[PDB]
Design a protein around this nucleic acid. Structure first.
Ligand SMILES: [Mg+2]
Ligand SMILES: [Mg+2]
Ligand SMILES: [Mg+2]
Ligand SMILES: [Mg+2]
Ligand SMILES: [Mg+2]
Ligand SMILES: [Mg+2]
Ligand SMILES: [Mg+2]
Ligand SMILES: [Mg+2]
Ligand SMILES: [Mg+2]
Ligand SMILES: [Mg+2]
Ligand SMILES: [Mg+2]
Ligand SMILES: [Mg+2]
Ligand SMILES: [Mg+2]
Ligand SMILES: [Mg+2]
Ligand SMILES: [Mg+2]
Ligand SMILES: [Mg+2]
Ligand SMILES: [Mg+2]
Ligand SMILES: [Mg+2]
Ligand SMILES: [Mg+2]
Ligand SMILES: [Mg+2]
Ligand SMILES: [Mg+2]
Ligand SMILES: [Mg+2]
Ligand SMILES: [Mg+2]
Ligand SMILES: [Mg+2]
Ligand SMILES: [Mg+2]
Ligand SMILES: [Mg+2]
Ligand SMILES: [Mg+2]
Ligand SMILES: [Mg+2]
Ligand SMILES: [Mg+2]
Ligand SMILES: [Mg+2]
Ligand SMILES: [Mg+2]
Ligand SMILES: [Mg+2]
Ligand SMILES: [Mg+2]
Ligand SMILES: [Mg+2]
Lengths: 141, 63, 70, 55, 56, 145, 63, 143, 206
RNA sequence: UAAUUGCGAUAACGAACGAGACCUUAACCUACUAAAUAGUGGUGCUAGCAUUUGCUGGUUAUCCACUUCUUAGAGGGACUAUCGGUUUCAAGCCGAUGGAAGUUUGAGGCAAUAACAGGUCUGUGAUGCCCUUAGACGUUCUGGGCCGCACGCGCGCUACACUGACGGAGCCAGCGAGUCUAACCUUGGCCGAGAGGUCUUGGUAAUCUUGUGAAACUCCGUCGUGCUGGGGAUAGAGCAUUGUAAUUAUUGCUCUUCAACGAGGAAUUCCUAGUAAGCGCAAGUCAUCAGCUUGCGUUGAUUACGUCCCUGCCCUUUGUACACACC
């Protein structure tokens, strides 16, 4: 076996799992390159980690991610979290601490919750309205 | 609002009354204390009590 | 029904000679030049690009954008 | 359900639920121990089923 | 036989609801207080908790 | 597609099936200002008449126009589904017609008449000027006639 | 035209019957050493910069 | 290098595979094209007219390449959209099983998909071959 | 910029811009400065972003609204009038086209021009409905910076929306149009007019 | 303070119900126990492309290993913590750092005393009294009616388009539910424009339907501001489905007909964050029928973070000839 870690990233209900082993430098999502992804407007949102931390860093590693659940935007945020959390998970086990804490440093700095799973969730609708807060309509008489 | 109920503050009162040696300005050890030293039915109630005996401790120290 | 649905030869040469000084050209800018509806105006955008004048600096549907040649 | 038997009042709704928990444990044994372990370990409320075979 | 696990468990509950009724009526002048039904191999067992088992 | 040219070859407005058709519109939609010819029937007919939907009603050879007329009023001959036709299974000779232009009015009348003349409740109700299709009339439709 | 720039220094409270106006003591930045009290329209905190349009005129209460 | 179709953006691939299936001249287009409407949840027939059957054949191809097996119904539910029930709310509705089934037969007869076990239609080895090929072709245009 | 590649390759200007400057869609975040004292601290610009889309929790505290990147505040306030609630991808792309268009006319960082229009439209003072006894006069009030930014955004988008409604120009052409005329106040823009009016009335009741 | 929540003042001291605690659900565990009904890495068997290793798939058992993702048992975790402002330096409140989480953590379950001539005898084989009881007000069968249409009022659905309709193409959820002495959820294969038909099939279910390939949405075109290709009422004709039965048209499909509505007077409802709004789905109901409801996830703002002006209500003080309590 080779050196490798696995991670995940989660926005709403999209969970994005990432395998980060040692290799020649692929960055594949589901089964296609990261240069597709589309959304497209949100393309750079998944490029973001690789450019925040220098593109080179991915030259001794292979990166695969697969996404289930969530919606279109939900998944794009779930994958970018899993790629960056993965990059720091491999430096945490294989390269040194000061490099891991420099990646966490340039991530957390700019950020967008690249390492930190956003905790927003849907609030339950309750009886009397079509939404959770939104009550229906009265007219009195 | 985070106004502690009477039971919290009353229990904190009796604890510091009779166990001031032991306890500290540290919640985490006061918490473990409240386990081995009182009989609280719930984790949450015990953390509230302990976190409050800790506040009274931290501010008894300056008067 | 208020005109701009064909080509009238003079309109062609009008288009050829009026598209400098257009920092902006798109479907709306062609229409606003008192001519071509949004059908044939898009053809004008595909064909003024056949060679010259318009530099495509924008992409797609609804929104088009071109600038003068250099 | 609607809380009311009739129809008057605000339209308060009330929701009931029953929780069904299912486990399965796979064991390889002879006949004796199976029959010993299933005639005992009886419990009112726990629904026990003991299947066999590979199909 | 052969009924889904959900329908089974509800059906078991209704079986208790109906048994608790019938006893609550049929054993009133004997202080009927409740039932429990234990399922076993061979038998299905019903235990009548009442305050007067000489009349039961 | 392509910048075109042409000369005085297209004349605006042109009258077919006793109605008038504006030029300068994309021909497929121009035949819809004729009665009994919607966007589907128009489409299929211009597809079947060997015409370029890209063209406007403006151009089109007189040959093309006449072929269009021919196909519209003879749909089953030029292989058109019959489930594509508004007046299937007539009600007397049982053939499949596609009633067109000033004729759809007549058949609405003829059909309505038939129900009234039979005294059938749909007739009665068309005679009273109400809603036939069974919809509640208490609340809806009040401006009306 | 004369623009006067004044830095919020203290928050005094809500005015207006409805309670959305806020009374504020401001120290204009071009030559300090002089305070005026103005009334705001939007949300305000300490150390903001209000564009007083007429430099000498203050108000107090609001109905 | 090496290549799959998973290496090509969806639209320039399918556009390419369409123009190829076009060029080809081998295909089989039942006949009721141009008169048909792809879904009872639709308003106008396709605007490609002389074509689109290639586009959906390419579309169906790439879809069956991407996974184990897919039947006529999965393609119906896939190619089904939102039907405006006029004045009533929208609803999801499935598209035509004739169009898709006749596509699966005109691509199986052209050996690019094959009745699979378990069920549905599986991508053909010869299809893998030719899809990966034109995929490579489509990237080659971007050089 | 020293190109680098690995297995799945990453494009030219993609690598180039990214690892170098941390700029927008592809526009400059350095330079561009708020040409007015105040409004700073309430117009973002730095830290820079790629595209105006963020899972930001700018709401669960009073003023944190002010630390949101300003362009995204513009984009956010695009996606309204019931039909376009949500639909931020729609808004984001409109903004991209809009910045491209503004850039076409009169050069300038189009993001800078945006900053210019936002500054130039916040009303320096307004009026409020005082009681004062039934017949209510109008008290002139000096409005906050934050309310000046907010009202600027809502003004420019809304007047751009009324102007794009029912005519051939697209939302991005009219948004750009409003951001162009309002960048340097020309009173041919819905925003400048309304700002000038709120100040005229506020002056006239002081 | 959300709270008779507390501090404090104190002829009161110390307490109990109720609030809080508690319970349920949504958040965090590369720590613990495990999983061919969940999934991952390796290995074979094998396809495709490049060939220099490589990339992308197939294979309910061909084996080995793991438990990050998924499942739910047991724990842990937050106590508004650390620091600093503010406050009688009190309870508390505010800001920053940290943190899965710092608005009662978010959302609910539960919930004292007392009141109402609120509603329900049309849920009950719960019931007093009255009425009726064979030319029945019992019950059943046939048919009609609850849908009837000058018009007033309330909940709603669809729209007036170009942040759009249409057409190709992209392609992503979560809460559910499903057949025994029966015909429920249904993949797949053919046939059919469709709606549907038909031959088989899996599933009493984390195993099959189902990854519920949902819809908004994304992309490339066509249309070009024209009641227009926005809008889809009204209506004619034809095909199907549930049912013993579809006429006053159960629903579904196809063609055609192509209304009002060009943003809505005075008025008035709901709402503060994954909320509002936009979007669809599942469940109830259901032989057939959702423009309804109950939940669910998808996309995801603007604006406050205040006040007592309007309204509604609680609290004291005060008057009382009321106490069946201003009906
Ligand atoms: Mg919801
Ligand atoms: Mg017509
Ligand atoms: Mg779909
Ligand atoms: Mg589609
Ligand atoms: Mg309360
Ligand atoms: Mg090698
Ligand atoms: Mg090799
Ligand atoms: Mg685990
Ligand atoms: Mg923080
Ligand atoms: Mg809780
Ligand atoms: Mg009464
Ligand atoms: Mg009752
Ligand atoms: Mg009675
Ligand atoms: Mg009942
Ligand atoms: Mg009872
Ligand atoms: Mg009776
Ligand atoms: Mg009724
Ligand atoms: Mg009424
Ligand atoms: Mg109601
Ligand atoms: Mg579309
Ligand atoms: Mg047929
Ligand atoms: Mg079977
Ligand atoms: Mg699922
Ligand atoms: Mg009009
Ligand atoms: Mg339409
Ligand atoms: Mg009937
Ligand atoms: Mg009737
Ligand atoms: Mg029309
Ligand atoms: Mg309106
Ligand atoms: Mg019915
Ligand atoms: Mg239903
Ligand atoms: Mg109902
Ligand atoms: Mg007196
Ligand atoms: Mg008194």
């Amino acid at each position: 076996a080779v050196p490798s870690v696995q991670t995940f990233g989660k926005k709403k209900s999209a969970t994005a799992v990432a395998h980060v082993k040692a290799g020649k430098g692929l960055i594949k999502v589901n089964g296609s390159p990261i240069t597709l992804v589309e959304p497209e407007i949100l393309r750079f949102k998944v490029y973001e980690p690789l450019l925040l931390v220098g593109l080179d860093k991915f030259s001794n590693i292979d990166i695969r991610v697969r996404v289930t659940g969530g919606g279109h935007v939900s998944q794009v945020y779930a994958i970018r979290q899993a790629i960056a959390k993965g990059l720091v998970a491999y430096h945490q086990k294989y390269v040194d601490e000061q490099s891991k804490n420099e990646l966490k440093k340039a991530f957390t700095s700019y950020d967008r919750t690249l390492l930190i799973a956003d905790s927003r969730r849907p609030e339950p609708k309750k009886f009397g309205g079509k939404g959770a807060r939104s009550r229906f309509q009265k007219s009195y008489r | 609002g985070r106004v502690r109920t009477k039971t919290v503050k009353r229990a904190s009162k009796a604890l510091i009354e009779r166990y001031y040696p032991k306890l500290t300005l540290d919640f985490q050890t006061n918490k473990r204390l409240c386990d081995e030293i009182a009989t609280i039915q719930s984790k949450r109630l015990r953390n509230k009590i302990a976190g409050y005996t800790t506040h009274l401790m931290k501010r008894i120290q300056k008067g | 029904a208020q005109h701009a649905v064909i080509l009238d030869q003079e309109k062609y040469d009008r288009i050829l000679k009026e598209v400098p000084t257009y920092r902006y050209v798109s479907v709306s800018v062609l229409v606003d030049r008192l001519k071509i509806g949004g059908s044939l105006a898009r053809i004008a955008l595909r064909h003024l690009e056949k060679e010259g004048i318009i530099k495509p600096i924008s992409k797609h549907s609804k929104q088009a954008i071109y600038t003068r040649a250099t | 359900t609607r809380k009311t038997p009739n129809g008057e009042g605000s339209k308060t709704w009330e929701t009931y639920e029953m929780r069904i928990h299912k486990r399965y444990i796979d064991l390889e044994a002879p006949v004796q121990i199976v029959k010993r372990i299933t005639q005992i370990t009886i419990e009112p409320g726990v629904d026990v089923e003991v299947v066999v075979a590979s199909n | 036989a052969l009924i889904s696990k959900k329908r089974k468990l509800v059906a078991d509950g209704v079986f208790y609801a109906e048994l608790n009724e019938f006893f609550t009526r049929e054993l009133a002048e004997e202080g009927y207080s409740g039932v429990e039904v234990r399922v076993t191999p061979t038998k299905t067992e019903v235990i009548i908790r009442a305050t007067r088992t000489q009349d039961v | 597609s392509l910048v075109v040219q042409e000369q005085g070859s297209f004349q605006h407005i042109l009258r077919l099936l006793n109605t008038n058709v504006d030029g300068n519109i994309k021909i497929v939609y121009a035949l819809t200002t004729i009665k009994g010819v919607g966007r589907r029937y128009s489409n299929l007919v211009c597809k079947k008449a060997d015409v370029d939907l890209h063209k406007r009603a403006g151009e089109l050879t007189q040959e093309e126009l006449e072929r269009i007329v021919q196909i519209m009023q003879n749909p089953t001959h030029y292989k058109i589904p019959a489930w594509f036709l508004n007046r299937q299974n007539d009600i007397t000779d049982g053939k499949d017609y596609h009633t067109l232009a000033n004729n759809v009015e007549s058949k609405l009348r003829d059909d309505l008449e038939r129900l009234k003349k039979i005294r059938a409740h749909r007739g009665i109700r068309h005679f009273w000027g109400l809603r036939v299709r069974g919809q509640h009339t208490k609340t809806t439709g009040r401006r009306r006639a | 035209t004369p623009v006067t720039l004044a830095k919020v220094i203290k928050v005094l409270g809500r005015t207006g019957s409805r309670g959305g106006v806020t009374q504020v003591r401001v120290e204009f930045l071009e030559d300090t050493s002089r305070t005026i009290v103005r009334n705001v329209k939007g949300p305000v905190r300490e150390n903001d910069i209000l564009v007083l349009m007429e430099s000498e005129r203050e108000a107090r209460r609001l109905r | 290098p090496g290549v799959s179709v998973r290496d090509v953006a969806a639209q320039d691939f399918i556009n390419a595979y369409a123009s190829f299936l076009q060029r080809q001249g081998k295909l089989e287009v039942p006949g009721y094209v141009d008169i048909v409407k792809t879904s009872s949840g639709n308003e106008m027939p396709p605007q490609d007219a002389e074509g689109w059957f290639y586009k959906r054949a390419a579309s169906v191809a790439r879809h069956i390449y991407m996974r184990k097996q897919v039947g006529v119904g999965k393609l119906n539910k896939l190619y089904g959209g939102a039907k405006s029930r006029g004045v009533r709310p929208y609803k999801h509705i499935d598209a035509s099983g004739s169009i898709n089934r006749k596509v699966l037969q005109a691509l199986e007869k052209i050996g690019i998909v094959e009745i699979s076990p378990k069920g549905g239609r599986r991508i053909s080895e010869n299809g893998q071959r030719d899809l990966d090929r034109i995929a490579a072709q489509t990237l080659e245009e971007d050089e | 910029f020293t190109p680098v590649v690995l297995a799945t390759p990453i494009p030219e200007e993609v690598q180039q811009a990214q690892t170098e400057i941390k700029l927008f869609n592809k526009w400059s975040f350095e330079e561009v400065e708020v040409k007015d004292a105040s409004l700073v601290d309430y117009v973002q610009v730095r830290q820079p972003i790629f595209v105006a889309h963020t899972a930001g929790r700018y709401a669960n505290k009073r003023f944190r609204k002010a630390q949101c990147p300003i362009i995204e505040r513009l984009t956010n306030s695009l996606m309204m009038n019931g039909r376009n609630n949500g639909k931020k991808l729609k808004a984001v792309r409109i903004i991209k086209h809009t910045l491209d268009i503004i850039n076409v006319l009169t050069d300038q960082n189009p993001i800078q021009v945006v900053v210019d229009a936002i500054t130039n439209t916040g009303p320096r003072e307004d009026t409020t409905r005082v009681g004062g006894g039934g017949a209510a006069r109008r008290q002139a009030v000096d409005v906050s910076p934050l309310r000046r930014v907010n009202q600027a955004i809502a003004l420019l988008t809304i007047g751009a929306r009324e102007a794009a409604f029912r005519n051939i120009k697209t939302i991005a052409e009219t948004l750009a149009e409003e951001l162009i005329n309002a960048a340097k106040g020309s009173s041919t823009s819905y925003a400048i007019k309304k700002k000038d009016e709120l100040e005229r009335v506020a002056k006239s009741n002081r």
